[PDB]
Write a protein that binds this ligand. Structure first.
Ligand SMILES: Cc1cc2nc3c(=O)[nH]c(=O)nc-3n(C[C@H](O)[C@H](O)[C@H](O)COP(=O)(O)OP(=O)(O)OC[C@H]3O[C@@H](n4cnc5c(N)ncnc54)[C@H](O)[C@@H]3O)c2cc1C
Ligand SMILES: NC(=O)c1ccc[n+]([C@@H]2O[C@H](COP(=O)([O-])OP(=O)(O)OC[C@H]3O[C@@H](n4cnc5c(N)ncnc54)[C@H](OP(=O)(O)O)[C@@H]3O)[C@@H](O)[C@H]2O)c1
Length: 630
């Protein structure tokens, strides 16, 4: 009569697993802290006044999307929290409010200790406890009445970018003292229509060849184009050292990106009702517009600073600042876990299988410790939830995965990390590799060889690998996913543009593909040609923000020392930007060809002529093997 499952921590990550355990009537208990999460801190202090950096389709679960999806949008922080609270309310009767202090792991059960002193025995234990993040305080607590101060950031990430969005409108000057950072427009115009960047990744093209996929994806990350319109050419300090990368899989696991509103897309969405959109949490966070306008400056990583005087020395200027912001040492909130009830478990992402199954522990699973490169967490945690549910409820599956666990882990690490040493961001994966890897392990994947029509090929290769893609049919089918996929296909032209992109670069080398990617009137990422024209909009924006936030600040004060630092900062840009002056034309022809053979039988396509041949060979991709599954 021992408890079959104990889930520790209930916020967001645990929802889909609890839903599947309920469906199979598997006995479970949830234990979760009375104190809740950062989302409760932000709710309590009235600071749910921002929006997600991820699309609806990747940030909410399949069983919500089938009801509530009518169009792409970026949810607000308020909507995200409201959804956590709705699901909390569904499962509250299954939640014990307490805090787990210790887990003793035995051969086929665990002893869970709590701060109350109550103990629990459970055959299977799932940890969904999230992360402690140092920067959460800056969001939950730090003040909006600071003005004309200098901030120094040693780190750039989504949390820094959100703080910078809130600081800039109070004429706070931002110095970024960095080893580089990857920033990407969260939204792109494709023939007039907005696509979130997660929709453009067509990840199953990795199976055609890693080199094809690499030149399709990596030109905005690695400094491959000489095009003077690209932020990494106007502001070379943004470039990172990627010498650590030792994998043929691109983008590599361990690559992080900050996702941001470019001001042109911000204007297209919000220009009509600006004050009301800002009050909902749609905040302009265009880092490239900040670099362009000098409201942010980059300085070298080894730039000298004096923590005692609160001074940084740049442009022969000893420069004084109100705050230095170090940046996150973000790590899982794990209680002490005792192996054989004796030896403390040591957590390392790479030593777990798919970030879920730790070694040396029996029937313990980790849920929510894998971070998506792009898109929302929902895609990751939905698929992790199905994997965990199958391991808990199907001993045949549990035995299959565990029998060769150490060899699977080795084969995964070889494929994705190679000989690179563990890094603090190992837990970050391309979402469309991870979801597909789990789907193949579970057996709810699609087979490329079973596509019959060109349409079927578009769905396999070009429809994004969102978790709901794998819940149309088979073991984990969700009612309404058919109608969801239809709605999404109908609105994005079946992802024909994405498909044609790969068709267009199949013969190119990586340098040719990089130039082609940037030959558009507006390329997807970091296009500095689409900033100057929005300066008037920016002033309308700052006024609307100030008005929403009851701020007064006069834009007359002149920080001549800043100007000199900005001028020193923006010197490569003042050389390169005057040098300014195929993708659009090629895409147009490609989409015409594809939409016209949509319902054509693939296997029977005849021997633009050579693009049909390549299309036919997509039935037999030569790079399909994943040795951690086989
Ligand atoms: C500022 C911010 C912005 C974000 N923006 C986005 C976004 O745009 N898109 C997106 O997809 N994701 C975003 N995320 C990430 C992610 O969606 C959230 O971090 C989410 O809260 C993770 O859910 P979780 O359930 O893993 O953890 P949490 O939501 O933190 O919930 C875990 C729960 O477990 C409890 N707990 C912890 N330890 C114990 C213990 N020992 N015993 C008992 N209970 C315990 C905690 O109190 C908490 O209530 C953002 C995160 C932050 C902080
Ligand atoms: N769906 C999601 O899960 C999701 C998505 C987006 C945002 N978020 C939220 O926003 C936050 C984003 O992370 P964070 O701001 O807390 O800190 P972080 O991104 O974990 O840390 C950023 C640091 O990582 C290093 N880094 C290494 N490679 C980099 C690259 N290519 N680009 C940029 N930085 C790189 C840099 O420091 P060094 O160079 O000094 O090592 C940088 O300062 C999350 O904590 C989360 O709260 C969640």
């Amino acid at each position: 009569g021992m408890l079959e499952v104990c889930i520790i921590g209930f916020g967001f990550s645990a929802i889909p697993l609890v839903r599947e355990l309920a469906r199979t009537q598997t006995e479970f208990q949830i234990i979760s802290a009375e104190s809740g999460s950062v989302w409760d801190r932000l709710s309590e202090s009235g600071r749910l006044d921002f929006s997600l950096v991820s699309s609806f389709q990747t940030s909410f679960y399949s069983f919500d999307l089938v009801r509530d999806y009518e169009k792409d949008y970026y949810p607000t922080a308020k909507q995200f929290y409201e959804m956590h609270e709705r699901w909390r309310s569904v499962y509250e009767e299954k939640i014990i409010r307490d805090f787990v202090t210790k887990i003793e792991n035995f051969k086929d059960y665990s002893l869970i200790s709590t701060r109350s002193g109550k103990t629990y025995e459970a055959k299977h234990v799932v940890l969904a406890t999230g992360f402690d993040r140092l920067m959460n305080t800056f969001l939950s607590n730090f003040d909006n009445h600071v003005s004309n101060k200098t901030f120094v950031f040693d780190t750039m990430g989504d949390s820094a970018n959100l703080l910078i969005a809130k600081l800039i409108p109070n004429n706070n000057k931002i110095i970024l003292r960095t080893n580089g950072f990857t920033a990407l427009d969260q939204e792109v115009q494709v023939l007039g229509k907005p696509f979130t960047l997660d929709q453009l990744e067509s990840p199953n093209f990795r199976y055609v060849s890693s080199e094809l996929y690499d030149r399709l994806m990596m030109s905005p990350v690695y400094p491959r184009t000489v095009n003077p319109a690209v932020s990494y050419n106007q502001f070379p300090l943004i470039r990172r050292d990627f010498s650590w990368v030792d994998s043929k899989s691109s983008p590599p696991n361990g690559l992080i990106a900050i996702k941001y509103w470019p001001i042109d897309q911000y204007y297209y969405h919000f220009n009509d009702d600006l004050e009301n959109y800002i009050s909902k949490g749609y905040l302009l966070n265009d880092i490239a517009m900040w670099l362009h306008t000098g409201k942010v400056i980059l300085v070298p990583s080894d730039t000298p600073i004096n923590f005692d005087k609160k001074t940084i020395t740049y442009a022969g200027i000893e420069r004084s600042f109100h705050q230095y912001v170090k940046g996150d040492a973000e790590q899982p909130r794990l209680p002490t876990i005792l192996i054989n009830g004796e030896t403390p478990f040591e957590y390392l992402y790479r030593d777990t299988f798919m970030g879920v199954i730790p070694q040396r522990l029996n029937n313990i699973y980790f849920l929510g410790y894998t971070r998506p490169f792009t898109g929302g967490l929902a895609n990751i945690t939905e698929m992790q939830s199905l994997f965990i549910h199958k391991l808990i409820t199907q001993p045949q599956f549990h035995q299959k995965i565990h029998q060769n666990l150490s060899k699977r882990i080795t084969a995964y690490n070889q494929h994705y990390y190679g000989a690179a040493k563990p890094r603090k961001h190992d837990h970050t994966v391309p979402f469309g590799f991870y979801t597909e890897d789990i789907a193949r392990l579970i057996g709810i994947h699609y087979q490329p060889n079973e596509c019959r029509s060109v349409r079927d090929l578009l769905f396999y290769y070009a429809f994004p690998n969102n978790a709901f893609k794998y819940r149309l049919k088979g073991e984990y089918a969700v009612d309404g996913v058919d109608e969801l996929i239809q709605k999404v296909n109908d609105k994005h032209d079946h992802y024909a543009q994405v498909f044609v992109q790969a068709l267009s670069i199949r013969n190119m080398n990586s340098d040719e593909a990089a130039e082609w990617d940037h030959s558009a009137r507006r390329f997807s990422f970091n296009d500095m040609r689409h900033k100057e024209g929005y300066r008037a909009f920016l002033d309308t924006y700052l006024k609307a923000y100030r008005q929403v936030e009851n701020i007064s600040v006069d834009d007359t004060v002149v920080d001549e020392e800043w100007n000199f630092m900005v001028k020193e900062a923006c010197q490569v840009r003042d050389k390169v930007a005057p040098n300014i002056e195929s993708k659009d034309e090629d895409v147009n022809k490609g989409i015409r060809l594809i939409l016209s053979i949509l319902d054509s039988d693939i296997s029977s396509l005849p021997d633009e002529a050579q693009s049909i041949e390549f299309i036919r060979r997509l039935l037999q991709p030569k790079n399909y093997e994943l040795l951690f599954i086989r």
